[PDB]
């Protein structure tokens, strides 16, 4: 939202040319991805009752 | 001879296995999905609401065994199979009453 321009020419004296520049930031979010193995496996419930 | 002729003793364990499998079903739909380390969180829940209710109670002998009502462990054998299990101490009922009279 804040915008606010800058001159970039002395005068008109030399060549008549008006010239007027901005700046800006850009925010980027890479990404990085980190490679991995499947494996499958198995998981039981049992109940039981104690002593 | 299995201290399961007596009626509440499998009751207590079908009503237990009911909740575990509501639970499980719905752990399924999680992001992760079924997990020995959400497994044992909820059957915790549920196995003290149970001692609460006073259905598990501590074992006869302490010194035999511990004062815990119920034991849940996890154990792991390779990396393929996994193992949860929980062990319990139902409570007793009274049925059988002796009196012995004397005479000073």
Known sequence: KSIAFQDLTTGTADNRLFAVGLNLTVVAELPILAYMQQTTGTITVKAKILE | ?104
């Open chain 2, 1 to 104: 001879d299995n201290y399961l002729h007596f009626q509440h003793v499998p009751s207590l364990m079908n009503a237990i296995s009911r909740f575990f499998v509501q639970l499980a079903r719905q752990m399924k739909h999680s992001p992760d999905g079924i997990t020995a380390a959400g497994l044992t969180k909820g059957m915790t829940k549920l196995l003290d609401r149970f001692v609460a209710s006073g259905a598990l109670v501590a074992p006869r002998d302490p010194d035999a065994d511990g004062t815990e009502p119920y034991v849940l462990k996890v154990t792991q054998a390779e990396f393929d199979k996994w193992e949860v299990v929980w062990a319990c101490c139902p409570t007793g009922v009274a049925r059988r009453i002796q009196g012995v009279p004397l005479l000073i």
